[PDB]
Amino acid sequence: SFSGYLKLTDNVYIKNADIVEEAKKVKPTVVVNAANVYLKHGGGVAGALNKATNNAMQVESDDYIATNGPLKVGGSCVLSGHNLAKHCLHVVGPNVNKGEDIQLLKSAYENFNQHEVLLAPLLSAGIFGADPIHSLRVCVDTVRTNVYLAVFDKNLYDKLVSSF
Numbered sequence: 001s002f003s004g005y006l007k008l009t010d011n012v013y014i015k016n017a018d019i020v021e022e023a024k025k026v027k028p029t030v031v032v033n034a035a036n037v038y039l040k041h042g043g044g045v046a047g048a049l050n051k052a053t054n055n056a057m058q059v060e061s062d063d064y065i066a067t068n069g070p071l072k073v074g075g076s077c078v079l080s081g082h083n084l085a086k087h088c089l090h091v092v093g094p095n096v097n098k099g100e101d102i103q104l105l106k107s108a109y110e111n112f113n114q115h116e117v118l119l120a121p122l123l124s125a126g127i128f129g130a131d132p133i134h135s136l137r138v139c140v141d142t143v144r145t146n147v148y149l150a151v152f153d154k155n156l157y158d159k160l161v162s163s164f
């Protein structure tokens with residue numbers, strides 16, 4: 001039910017929107033979370049998605065970490081999408097503010113290729129500290145499945161489109 005997106009490539013689309021509000025409207029098969037390795041959903045996309053689930057995402061995530069241990073930077077896991085989507089794909093992009101290797105951003109986006117269509121944010125951008133223009137270029141050059149990108153900041157959205 002995706003609507004109002006700008007086509008960037010054969011398989012990549014973009015919209016100025018809060019990913020939480022997009023997930024409530026569309027109820028997609030997969031929503032991507034910008035996770036950390038511990039699945040501690042405090043702020044940014046992860047804190048906003050978790051709050052919209054009334055903390056059910058964090059309770060499920062804590063059980064997953066208690067059983068499996070932490071994810072790898074560049075890795076992912078599939079958990080419930082609760083009231084927002086059928087599934088949530090928690091993907092860990094490198095956090096530049098912590099010295100993590102930006103080359104791991106391509107490995108993070110490769111997780112998207114396991115799903116035919118996804119609603120997603122720009123990985124490693126926002127509070128993770130990487131350049132969003134770089135993140136969109138890695139997304140375009142790595143993901144082959146259909147990805148609908150939601151960018152919250154209007155000013156950044158306009159810059160991403162103009163410089164594409």
Ligand SMILES: CC(C)[C@@H](Nc1ncnc2[nH]ccc12)C(=O)O
Nearest residue numbers: 018019044045125126151152153
């Ligand atoms: C990742 C980053 C580039 C982006 N953040 C987001 N993008 C989309 N929905 C969101 N909900 C909460 C945060 C958020 C932004 O600052 O525009």
